[PDB]
Design a protein around this ligand. Structure first.
Ligand SMILES: CO[C@@H]1O[C@H](CO)[C@H](O)[C@H](OC(=O)c2ccc(C)cc2)[C@@H]1OC(=O)c1ccc(Cl)cc1[N+](=O)[O-]
Ligand SMILES: [Cl-]
Length: 138
């Protein structure tokens, strides 16, 4: 497996039609996972499965600007399971990131950070064994 936390450079940032694919396996007894699409120190798109928030499983998404988290967007549909292999696909679209897990649409996150071509790294962290992280233009 790739070492977590893992940094995937996104050369020249992101652009519509860029598809980012993450393959990994959730650890046993997982607590949290994060994908962080970063513009320097800012986080344009934080995608955070939480396995135990008040004994509920939720995906939290947010943006971090000048070290401040903004308004969370929450999705109760929770396709991850401890111990199991997953595929996360993040397709950049003109006005949002579109996320599918295990080939099923999960959520979209509208662009708050406008300079897409400066969102130049993806950080992958938390309670996974990371198998691969890659991108392709579709
Ligand atoms: C207020 O809390 C913060 O909320 C932000 C979103 O608004 C981020 O989600 C932060 O995430 C991390 O810092 C972060 C996320 C994932 C990794 C692997 C590493 C770091 C942090 O979340 C928690 O501290 C948090 C609060 C309550 C619960 Cl139950 C779980 C989390 N969490 O997953 O971090
Ligand atoms: Cl911006």
């Amino acid at each position: 497996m790739l070492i977590v936390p893992y940094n995937l450079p996104l050369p020249g940032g992101v652009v519509p039609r860029m598809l980012i694919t993450i393959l990994g396996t959730v650890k046993p007894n997982a607590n949290r996972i994060a994908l962080d699409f970063q513009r320097g120190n800012d986080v344009a798109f934080h995608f955070n499965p939480r396995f135990n928030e008040n004994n509920r499983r939720v995906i939290v998404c947010n943006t971090k600007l000048d070290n401040n988290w903004g308004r969370e967007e929450r999705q109760s549909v929770f396709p991850f399971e401890s111990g199991k292999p997953f595929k996360i696909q993040v397709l950049v679209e003109p006005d949002h990131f579109k996320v599918a897990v295990n080939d099923a649409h999960l959520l979209q996150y509208n662009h708050r950070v406008k300079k897409l071509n400066e969102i130049s790294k993806l950080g992958i962290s938390g309670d996974i064994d990371l198998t691969s992280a890659s991108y392709t233009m579709i």
